[PDB]
Protein backbone atom coordinates (compact mmCIF):
# COMPACT_ATOMS: atom_id res chain seq x y z
CA UNK A 1 0.00 0.00 0.00
CA UNK A 2 0.86 3.69 -0.29
CA UNK A 3 2.51 3.99 3.12
CA UNK A 4 4.17 0.58 3.01
CA UNK A 5 3.17 -0.76 6.44
CA UNK A 6 -0.17 -2.62 6.32
CA UNK A 7 0.15 -5.77 4.18
CA UNK A 8 3.53 -4.19 3.52
CA UNK A 9 6.67 -4.59 5.61
CA UNK A 10 4.44 -5.51 8.56
CA UNK A 11 3.20 -8.57 6.70
CA UNK A 12 0.09 -9.54 8.62
CA UNK A 13 -2.51 -8.45 11.13
CA UNK A 14 -2.99 -9.66 14.70
CA UNK A 15 -6.23 -11.45 15.63
CA UNK A 16 -5.22 -10.97 19.26
CA UNK A 17 -5.52 -7.18 19.03
CA UNK A 18 -9.14 -6.94 20.17
CA UNK A 19 -9.47 -3.37 21.50
CA UNK A 20 -8.42 -1.36 18.47
CA UNK A 21 -6.90 -1.05 15.03
CA UNK A 22 -3.27 -0.36 15.97
CA UNK A 23 -1.11 -1.58 18.80
CA UNK A 24 2.03 -2.97 20.41
CA UNK A 25 3.25 -6.47 21.18
CA UNK A 26 6.19 -6.85 23.56
CA UNK A 27 8.44 -9.78 24.45
CA UNK A 28 10.58 -9.91 27.58
CA UNK A 29 11.40 -12.21 30.52
CA UNK A 30 7.92 -11.72 31.94
CA UNK A 31 6.23 -12.90 28.76
CA UNK A 32 4.56 -11.82 25.54
CA UNK A 33 1.50 -9.63 25.17
CA UNK A 34 -0.25 -7.08 23.00
CA UNK A 35 -2.67 -4.21 23.44
CA UNK A 36 -4.09 -1.47 21.25
CA UNK A 37 -2.58 2.00 21.32
CA UNK A 38 -5.49 4.12 22.57
CA UNK A 39 -4.18 7.49 21.38
CA UNK A 40 -3.69 6.55 17.72
CA UNK A 41 -6.80 4.35 17.57
CA UNK A 42 -9.17 6.90 19.10
CA UNK A 43 -7.90 9.68 16.82
CA UNK A 44 -8.50 7.43 13.80
CA UNK A 45 -11.96 6.47 15.08
CA UNK A 46 -12.99 10.11 15.42
CA UNK A 47 -11.77 10.95 11.92
CA UNK A 48 -13.48 8.07 10.13
CA UNK A 49 -16.65 8.66 12.16
CA UNK A 50 -16.67 12.28 10.97
CA UNK A 51 -16.09 11.21 7.37
CA UNK A 52 -19.02 8.81 7.50
CA UNK A 53 -21.27 11.42 9.09
CA UNK A 54 -20.27 14.05 6.55
CA UNK A 55 -20.80 11.73 3.58
CA UNK A 56 -24.25 10.85 4.86
CA UNK A 57 -25.12 14.51 5.44
CA UNK A 58 -23.83 15.53 2.01
CA UNK A 59 -25.42 12.68 0.05
CA UNK A 60 -28.79 12.03 1.68
CA UNK A 61 -30.74 14.70 -0.26
CA UNK A 62 -33.44 13.23 -2.50
CA UNK A 63 -34.25 14.39 -6.02
CA UNK A 64 -37.85 14.38 -7.16
CA UNK A 65 -39.15 12.64 -10.24
CA UNK A 66 -42.89 12.54 -10.95
CA UNK A 67 -44.20 10.03 -13.48
CA UNK A 68 -45.97 12.65 -15.61
CA UNK A 69 -48.76 11.69 -18.00
CA UNK A 70 -48.48 12.75 -21.66
CA UNK A 71 -50.99 12.66 -24.52
CA UNK A 72 -50.50 10.96 -27.87
CA UNK A 73 -49.29 14.23 -29.37
CA UNK A 74 -46.76 15.00 -26.65
CA UNK A 75 -44.24 12.34 -27.63
CA UNK A 76 -41.39 14.84 -27.93
CA UNK A 77 -42.09 16.27 -24.46
CA UNK A 78 -42.28 12.70 -23.16
CA UNK A 79 -38.80 11.99 -24.60
CA UNK A 80 -37.35 15.23 -23.26
CA UNK A 81 -38.68 14.44 -19.78
CA UNK A 82 -37.19 10.95 -19.98
CA UNK A 83 -33.84 12.41 -21.00
CA UNK A 84 -33.84 14.64 -17.90
CA UNK A 85 -34.76 11.79 -15.57
CA UNK A 86 -32.26 9.36 -17.07
CA UNK A 87 -29.40 11.83 -16.72
CA UNK A 88 -30.35 12.98 -13.22
CA UNK A 89 -30.22 9.30 -12.20
CA UNK A 90 -27.01 8.51 -14.09
CA UNK A 91 -25.12 11.55 -12.84
CA UNK A 92 -26.05 11.02 -9.18
CA UNK A 93 -25.35 7.29 -9.34
CA UNK A 94 -21.93 8.08 -10.81
CA UNK A 95 -21.28 10.68 -8.09
CA UNK A 96 -22.27 8.21 -5.37
CA UNK A 97 -20.32 5.25 -6.73
CA UNK A 98 -17.17 7.27 -7.36
CA UNK A 99 -17.26 9.03 -3.99
CA UNK A 100 -17.39 5.66 -2.25
CA UNK A 101 -14.66 4.07 -4.40
CA UNK A 102 -12.31 7.03 -4.01
CA UNK A 103 -12.87 7.64 -0.30
CA UNK A 104 -12.42 3.90 0.30
CA UNK A 105 -8.92 4.12 -1.12
CA UNK A 106 -8.15 7.11 1.10
CA UNK A 107 -9.55 5.40 4.19
CA UNK A 108 -7.45 2.28 3.67
CA UNK A 109 -4.34 4.36 3.03
CA UNK A 110 -4.99 6.55 6.07
CA UNK A 111 -4.94 3.43 8.28
CA UNK A 112 -1.67 2.44 6.61
CA UNK A 113 -0.27 5.91 7.37
CA UNK A 114 -1.33 5.71 11.02
CA UNK A 115 0.54 2.44 11.46
CA UNK A 116 3.56 3.90 9.67
CA UNK A 117 3.51 6.99 11.89
CA UNK A 118 3.23 4.94 15.08
CA UNK A 119 6.15 2.75 13.95
CA UNK A 120 8.29 5.78 13.12
CA UNK A 121 7.44 7.41 16.46
CA UNK A 122 8.78 4.38 18.34
CA UNK A 123 11.81 4.08 16.05
CA UNK A 124 12.69 7.70 16.78
CA UNK A 125 12.22 7.27 20.52
CA UNK A 126 14.44 4.17 20.70
CA UNK A 127 17.30 5.61 18.67
CA UNK A 128 20.45 3.49 18.77
CA UNK A 129 19.05 1.42 21.66
CA UNK A 130 17.34 -0.94 19.23
CA UNK A 131 17.65 -2.48 15.78
CA UNK A 132 14.80 -2.97 13.31
CA UNK A 133 14.13 -6.58 12.37
CA UNK A 134 12.45 -5.33 9.19
CA UNK A 135 9.09 -6.88 10.05
CA UNK A 136 7.68 -4.26 12.39
CA UNK A 137 9.71 -5.12 15.49
CA UNK A 138 12.50 -3.42 17.41
CA UNK A 139 15.09 -5.69 19.04
CA UNK A 140 16.23 -3.85 22.16
CA UNK A 141 19.94 -3.79 23.04
CA UNK A 142 19.16 -3.76 26.75
CA UNK A 143 16.81 -5.67 29.03
CA UNK A 144 13.39 -4.04 29.09
CA UNK A 145 10.86 -5.14 31.71
CA UNK A 146 7.15 -4.28 31.73
CA UNK A 147 7.72 -0.82 33.21
CA UNK A 148 10.37 -0.15 30.57
CA UNK A 149 7.98 -1.35 27.86
CA UNK A 150 5.32 1.02 29.18
CA UNK A 151 7.58 4.07 28.76
CA UNK A 152 7.95 3.08 25.11
CA UNK A 153 4.19 2.73 24.64
CA UNK A 154 3.31 6.00 26.38
CA UNK A 155 6.19 7.87 24.76
CA UNK A 156 8.42 8.61 27.75
CA UNK A 157 11.24 6.17 26.97
CA UNK A 158 14.51 7.43 28.46
CA UNK A 159 17.34 6.99 25.93
CA UNK A 160 15.82 8.75 22.92
Amino acid sequence: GLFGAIAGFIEGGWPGLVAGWYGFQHSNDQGVGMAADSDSTQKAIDKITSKVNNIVDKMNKQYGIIDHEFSEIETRLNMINNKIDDQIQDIWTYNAELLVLLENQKTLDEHDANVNNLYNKVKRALGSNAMEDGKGCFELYHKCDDQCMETIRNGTYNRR
Partner: protein, 317 residues
Protein backbone atom coordinates in the same frame (compact mmCIF):
# COMPACT_ATOMS: atom_id res chain seq x y z
CA UNK B 1 13.65 -8.30 24.49
CA UNK B 2 11.65 -6.59 21.77
CA UNK B 3 8.61 -4.47 21.05
CA UNK B 4 6.62 -4.64 17.82
CA UNK B 5 4.06 -2.46 16.07
CA UNK B 6 1.07 -4.14 14.50
CA UNK B 7 -2.53 -3.83 13.40
CA UNK B 8 -5.80 -5.66 13.86
CA UNK B 9 -7.06 -8.63 11.87
CA UNK B 10 -10.55 -10.12 12.36
CA UNK B 11 -12.87 -12.79 10.95
CA UNK B 12 -14.87 -10.10 9.20
CA UNK B 13 -15.96 -11.20 5.72
CA UNK B 14 -16.70 -7.60 4.68
CA UNK B 15 -15.09 -6.35 1.48
CA UNK B 16 -15.10 -3.01 -0.33
CA UNK B 17 -14.03 -1.80 -3.76
CA UNK B 18 -11.66 0.98 -4.81
CA UNK B 19 -10.60 2.12 -8.27
CA UNK B 20 -7.35 0.10 -8.16
CA UNK B 21 -8.73 -3.07 -6.56
CA UNK B 22 -12.05 -4.85 -5.99
CA UNK B 23 -13.27 -7.05 -3.11
CA UNK B 24 -10.67 -5.70 -0.69
CA UNK B 25 -11.16 -7.45 2.69
CA UNK B 26 -11.68 -4.97 5.54
CA UNK B 27 -12.12 -5.26 9.30
CA UNK B 28 -15.12 -2.93 9.37
CA UNK B 29 -17.44 -1.43 6.74
CA UNK B 30 -20.76 0.39 6.47
CA UNK B 31 -23.48 -0.27 3.91
CA UNK B 32 -24.78 3.13 2.76
CA UNK B 33 -27.57 1.74 0.59
CA UNK B 34 -31.03 0.92 1.96
CA UNK B 35 -32.68 -1.85 -0.06
CA UNK B 36 -35.78 -2.91 1.89
CA UNK B 37 -39.39 -1.73 1.79
CA UNK B 38 -42.66 -2.88 3.41
CA UNK B 39 -44.49 -3.72 0.17
CA UNK B 40 -47.44 -1.48 1.13
CA UNK B 41 -49.00 1.89 0.35
CA UNK B 42 -48.98 3.81 3.63
CA UNK B 43 -49.50 7.32 4.92
CA UNK B 44 -46.59 9.78 4.88
CA UNK B 45 -45.92 12.86 6.96
CA UNK B 46 -48.60 14.54 4.81
CA UNK B 47 -51.27 12.00 5.67
CA UNK B 48 -53.16 9.15 4.03
CA UNK B 49 -53.45 8.65 0.26
CA UNK B 50 -56.68 8.97 -1.71
CA UNK B 51 -57.20 5.44 -3.03
CA UNK B 52 -59.45 5.24 -6.08
CA UNK B 53 -60.53 1.63 -6.59
CA UNK B 54 -63.53 2.08 -8.88
CA UNK B 55 -63.35 5.68 -10.10
CA UNK B 56 -60.71 7.56 -12.09
CA UNK B 57 -59.64 11.11 -11.26
CA UNK B 58 -61.78 12.60 -14.02
CA UNK B 59 -64.70 10.41 -12.97
CA UNK B 60 -64.46 12.02 -9.53
CA UNK B 61 -64.04 15.54 -10.90
CA UNK B 62 -67.04 15.36 -13.25
CA UNK B 63 -69.07 13.40 -10.71
CA UNK B 64 -69.68 10.10 -12.50
CA UNK B 65 -72.89 8.79 -10.83
CA UNK B 66 -70.95 5.71 -9.67
CA UNK B 67 -68.57 7.83 -7.58
CA UNK B 68 -70.99 9.26 -5.00
CA UNK B 69 -68.81 8.14 -2.08
CA UNK B 70 -66.43 10.90 -3.21
CA UNK B 71 -68.97 13.76 -3.30
CA UNK B 72 -68.29 14.69 0.32
CA UNK B 73 -64.74 15.85 -0.31
CA UNK B 74 -61.35 14.40 0.59
CA UNK B 75 -57.79 15.38 1.47
CA UNK B 76 -54.69 13.36 0.68
CA UNK B 77 -50.90 13.09 0.63
CA UNK B 78 -50.92 11.27 -2.74
CA UNK B 79 -53.36 9.56 -5.11
CA UNK B 80 -53.55 5.87 -5.99
CA UNK B 81 -55.54 4.80 -9.05
CA UNK B 82 -56.23 1.07 -8.97
CA UNK B 83 -56.37 -0.88 -12.24
CA UNK B 84 -59.97 -1.65 -11.28
CA UNK B 85 -60.84 2.06 -11.48
CA UNK B 86 -62.88 2.16 -14.69
CA UNK B 87 -65.59 4.70 -13.88
CA UNK B 88 -64.51 7.83 -15.72
CA UNK B 89 -66.53 9.57 -18.40
CA UNK B 90 -69.61 7.32 -18.62
CA UNK B 91 -71.18 9.21 -21.52
CA UNK B 92 -68.98 8.88 -24.68
CA UNK B 93 -66.62 11.81 -25.15
CA UNK B 94 -63.20 13.13 -24.25
CA UNK B 95 -61.90 15.66 -21.76
CA UNK B 96 -59.94 18.53 -23.32
CA UNK B 97 -56.47 18.78 -21.75
CA UNK B 98 -57.03 15.71 -19.56
CA UNK B 99 -53.40 15.34 -18.48
CA UNK B 100 -53.36 18.92 -17.19
CA UNK B 101 -56.66 18.45 -15.34
CA UNK B 102 -55.42 15.30 -13.59
CA UNK B 103 -52.09 16.95 -12.78
CA UNK B 104 -53.76 20.07 -11.35
CA UNK B 105 -56.08 17.93 -9.25
CA UNK B 106 -53.37 15.60 -7.96
CA UNK B 107 -51.12 18.52 -7.03
CA UNK B 108 -53.70 19.81 -4.55
CA UNK B 109 -54.21 18.12 -1.18
CA UNK B 110 -58.01 18.46 -1.00
CA UNK B 111 -61.22 19.37 -2.82
CA UNK B 112 -64.64 20.56 -1.67
CA UNK B 113 -67.63 20.84 -4.00
CA UNK B 114 -69.43 24.16 -4.43
CA UNK B 115 -72.68 24.82 -6.27
CA UNK B 116 -72.29 27.20 -9.21
CA UNK B 117 -75.72 27.25 -10.88
CA UNK B 118 -78.80 26.23 -8.87
CA UNK B 119 -81.37 24.12 -10.73
CA UNK B 120 -83.94 26.90 -10.20
CA UNK B 121 -82.14 29.39 -12.47
CA UNK B 122 -82.99 27.46 -15.65
CA UNK B 123 -86.07 27.98 -17.80
CA UNK B 124 -85.53 24.64 -19.54
CA UNK B 125 -85.35 21.02 -18.39
CA UNK B 126 -82.27 19.99 -16.40
CA UNK B 127 -82.83 16.40 -15.30
CA UNK B 128 -81.61 14.68 -18.46
CA UNK B 129 -80.06 11.26 -17.85
CA UNK B 130 -78.46 8.44 -19.84
CA UNK B 131 -78.40 4.65 -19.79
CA UNK B 132 -74.63 4.97 -20.24
CA UNK B 133 -74.45 6.71 -16.88
CA UNK B 134 -76.32 4.26 -14.64
CA UNK B 135 -79.61 5.74 -15.86
CA UNK B 136 -78.56 8.99 -14.23
CA UNK B 137 -76.04 11.75 -14.98
CA UNK B 138 -72.94 13.59 -13.73
CA UNK B 139 -73.19 15.36 -10.36
CA UNK B 140 -71.02 18.24 -11.61
CA UNK B 141 -73.19 19.24 -14.57
CA UNK B 142 -76.78 19.37 -15.76
CA UNK B 143 -77.93 18.12 -19.18
CA UNK B 144 -80.20 21.01 -20.19
CA UNK B 145 -82.96 20.15 -22.66
CA UNK B 146 -86.19 21.66 -23.98
CA UNK B 147 -89.16 22.15 -21.66
CA UNK B 148 -92.70 22.52 -23.03
CA UNK B 149 -91.28 22.22 -26.55
CA UNK B 150 -89.24 25.39 -26.04
CA UNK B 151 -85.61 26.26 -25.36
CA UNK B 152 -85.18 30.02 -24.83
CA UNK B 153 -81.65 31.40 -24.72
CA UNK B 154 -80.22 30.49 -21.31
CA UNK B 155 -78.02 33.16 -19.74
CA UNK B 156 -76.67 32.46 -16.25
CA UNK B 157 -73.99 34.16 -14.16
CA UNK B 158 -71.93 33.23 -11.11
CA UNK B 159 -69.38 35.38 -9.29
CA UNK B 160 -66.66 33.74 -7.21
CA UNK B 161 -66.78 35.34 -3.76
CA UNK B 162 -65.19 32.37 -1.98
CA UNK B 163 -61.69 33.81 -1.89
CA UNK B 164 -60.36 30.66 -3.56
CA UNK B 165 -60.25 29.52 -7.18
CA UNK B 166 -62.99 27.20 -8.41
CA UNK B 167 -62.40 24.38 -10.87
CA UNK B 168 -65.55 24.11 -13.00
CA UNK B 169 -66.73 21.74 -15.72
CA UNK B 170 -69.06 21.76 -18.72
CA UNK B 171 -69.75 19.90 -21.93
CA UNK B 172 -71.17 20.22 -25.42
CA UNK B 173 -73.54 17.51 -26.62
CA UNK B 174 -73.34 16.18 -30.19
CA UNK B 175 -76.50 14.19 -31.04
CA UNK B 176 -76.34 11.19 -33.45
CA UNK B 177 -79.27 12.38 -35.58
CA UNK B 178 -81.08 15.58 -36.57
CA UNK B 179 -84.24 14.29 -34.93
CA UNK B 180 -82.55 13.99 -31.54
CA UNK B 181 -81.05 17.46 -31.98
CA UNK B 182 -84.36 19.22 -32.64
CA UNK B 183 -86.10 16.84 -30.25
CA UNK B 184 -83.79 17.95 -27.42
CA UNK B 185 -83.03 21.58 -28.29
CA UNK B 186 -85.85 22.59 -30.67
CA UNK B 187 -83.25 23.77 -33.19
CA UNK B 188 -80.34 22.28 -35.16
CA UNK B 189 -78.17 25.40 -35.19
CA UNK B 190 -77.06 26.45 -31.71
CA UNK B 191 -74.41 28.63 -30.12
CA UNK B 192 -73.01 28.14 -26.62
CA UNK B 193 -70.52 30.38 -24.87
CA UNK B 194 -68.61 29.99 -21.61
CA UNK B 195 -66.94 33.23 -20.60
CA UNK B 196 -65.20 34.98 -17.71
CA UNK B 197 -62.99 38.06 -17.43
CA UNK B 198 -60.19 35.89 -18.85
CA UNK B 199 -61.77 33.31 -21.17
CA UNK B 200 -64.10 33.69 -24.15
CA UNK B 201 -65.02 30.21 -25.35
CA UNK B 202 -67.80 29.48 -27.84
CA UNK B 203 -69.08 26.16 -29.19
CA UNK B 204 -71.24 24.81 -32.02
CA UNK B 205 -72.79 21.32 -32.36
CA UNK B 206 -72.19 18.76 -35.13
CA UNK B 207 -74.90 16.12 -35.52
CA UNK B 208 -74.04 12.66 -36.80
CA UNK B 209 -73.40 9.13 -35.47
CA UNK B 210 -69.95 8.31 -34.09
CA UNK B 211 -68.74 4.73 -33.53
CA UNK B 212 -70.55 2.92 -30.71
CA UNK B 213 -69.26 3.57 -27.19
CA UNK B 214 -71.17 2.38 -24.13
CA UNK B 215 -73.99 1.62 -26.56
CA UNK B 216 -74.29 5.20 -27.82
CA UNK B 217 -73.60 6.98 -31.11
CA UNK B 218 -73.81 10.46 -29.64
CA UNK B 219 -71.05 12.32 -27.82
CA UNK B 220 -70.30 15.01 -25.27
CA UNK B 221 -67.08 16.99 -25.58
CA UNK B 222 -65.96 17.76 -22.02
CA UNK B 223 -64.19 20.93 -20.92
CA UNK B 224 -62.95 22.60 -17.74
CA UNK B 225 -61.41 25.81 -16.46
CA UNK B 226 -60.65 27.64 -13.22
CA UNK B 227 -62.59 30.63 -11.92
CA UNK B 228 -60.22 32.84 -9.94
CA UNK B 229 -61.39 34.78 -6.85
CA UNK B 230 -63.54 37.76 -7.75
CA UNK B 231 -64.07 36.59 -11.32
CA UNK B 232 -67.49 36.05 -12.86
CA UNK B 233 -68.48 33.03 -14.94
CA UNK B 234 -71.17 33.54 -17.55
CA UNK B 235 -72.76 30.88 -19.71
CA UNK B 236 -75.10 31.41 -22.66
CA UNK B 237 -76.75 28.77 -24.80
CA UNK B 238 -79.78 28.02 -26.92
CA UNK B 239 -78.99 24.31 -27.04
CA UNK B 240 -76.41 21.53 -26.64
CA UNK B 241 -74.88 22.89 -23.43
CA UNK B 242 -74.13 20.47 -20.58
CA UNK B 243 -74.11 23.19 -17.94
CA UNK B 244 -71.83 23.59 -14.90
CA UNK B 245 -73.73 22.58 -11.75
CA UNK B 246 -71.07 22.07 -9.07
CA UNK B 247 -67.40 23.00 -9.18
CA UNK B 248 -64.50 22.10 -6.89
CA UNK B 249 -62.47 24.30 -4.58
CA UNK B 250 -58.96 22.83 -4.64
CA UNK B 251 -56.65 23.60 -1.72
CA UNK B 252 -53.13 22.92 -0.49
CA UNK B 253 -50.20 21.02 -1.95
CA UNK B 254 -49.79 17.25 -1.64
CA UNK B 255 -46.87 15.14 -2.86
CA UNK B 256 -48.46 15.56 -6.29
CA UNK B 257 -48.24 11.90 -7.28
CA UNK B 258 -50.68 9.58 -9.04
CA UNK B 259 -49.62 5.97 -8.50
CA UNK B 260 -51.22 3.36 -10.75
CA UNK B 261 -50.83 0.07 -8.92
CA UNK B 262 -52.75 -2.67 -7.15
CA UNK B 263 -50.21 -2.75 -4.32
CA UNK B 264 -51.80 -3.50 -0.95
CA UNK B 265 -52.53 -0.50 1.25
CA UNK B 266 -51.97 -0.72 4.99
CA UNK B 267 -52.52 0.99 8.32
CA UNK B 268 -48.94 2.20 8.43
CA UNK B 269 -46.89 5.41 8.33
CA UNK B 270 -43.58 5.81 6.52
CA UNK B 271 -41.01 8.52 5.87
CA UNK B 272 -40.50 7.49 2.25
CA UNK B 273 -43.14 6.02 -0.07
CA UNK B 274 -42.65 4.38 -3.48
CA UNK B 275 -44.96 2.54 -5.86
CA UNK B 276 -43.37 -0.70 -4.59
CA UNK B 277 -43.66 -0.03 -0.87
CA UNK B 278 -42.52 2.37 1.83
CA UNK B 279 -39.49 2.66 4.08
CA UNK B 280 -37.81 4.31 7.05
CA UNK B 281 -34.03 4.74 7.20
CA UNK B 282 -31.14 7.01 8.13
CA UNK B 283 -28.91 5.69 5.34
CA UNK B 284 -28.12 8.27 2.61
CA UNK B 285 -29.13 6.12 -0.39
CA UNK B 286 -31.77 3.58 -1.42
CA UNK B 287 -32.40 1.50 -4.56
CA UNK B 288 -36.13 0.94 -4.17
CA UNK B 289 -37.44 3.39 -6.79
CA UNK B 290 -36.55 6.65 -8.51
CA UNK B 291 -40.20 7.61 -8.03
CA UNK B 292 -39.89 7.68 -4.23
CA UNK B 293 -41.44 10.64 -2.41
CA UNK B 294 -41.84 12.03 1.09
CA UNK B 295 -38.80 12.30 3.38
CA UNK B 296 -36.38 10.13 1.42
CA UNK B 297 -32.71 9.17 0.95
CA UNK B 298 -31.21 9.70 -2.52
CA UNK B 299 -32.14 7.04 -5.09
CA UNK B 300 -29.14 5.27 -6.65
CA UNK B 301 -29.46 2.42 -9.12
CA UNK B 302 -26.98 -0.05 -7.62
CA UNK B 303 -27.04 -3.19 -5.46
CA UNK B 304 -24.65 -2.03 -2.74
CA UNK B 305 -22.53 0.95 -1.64
CA UNK B 306 -20.14 -0.35 1.02
CA UNK B 307 -17.92 2.28 2.65
CA UNK B 308 -14.69 1.17 4.33
CA UNK B 309 -14.47 2.11 8.00
CA UNK B 310 -11.76 -0.21 9.28
CA UNK B 311 -8.46 -1.26 7.69
CA UNK B 312 -7.44 -3.91 5.16
CA UNK B 313 -8.07 -7.28 6.82
CA UNK B 314 -4.84 -9.29 6.52
CA UNK B 315 -4.75 -12.83 7.97
CA UNK B 316 -1.52 -13.74 9.77
CA UNK B 317 -1.77 -17.38 8.71
Amino acid sequence: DKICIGYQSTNSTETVDTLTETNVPVTHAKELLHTSHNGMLCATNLGHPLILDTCTIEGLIYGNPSCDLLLGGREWSYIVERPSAVNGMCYPGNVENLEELRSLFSSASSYQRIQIFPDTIWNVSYSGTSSACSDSFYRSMRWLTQKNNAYPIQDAQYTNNRGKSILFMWGINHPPTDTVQTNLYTRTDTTTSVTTEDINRTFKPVIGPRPLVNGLHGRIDYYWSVLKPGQTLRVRSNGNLIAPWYGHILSGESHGRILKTDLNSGNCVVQCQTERGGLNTTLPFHNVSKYAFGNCPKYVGVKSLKLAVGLRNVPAR
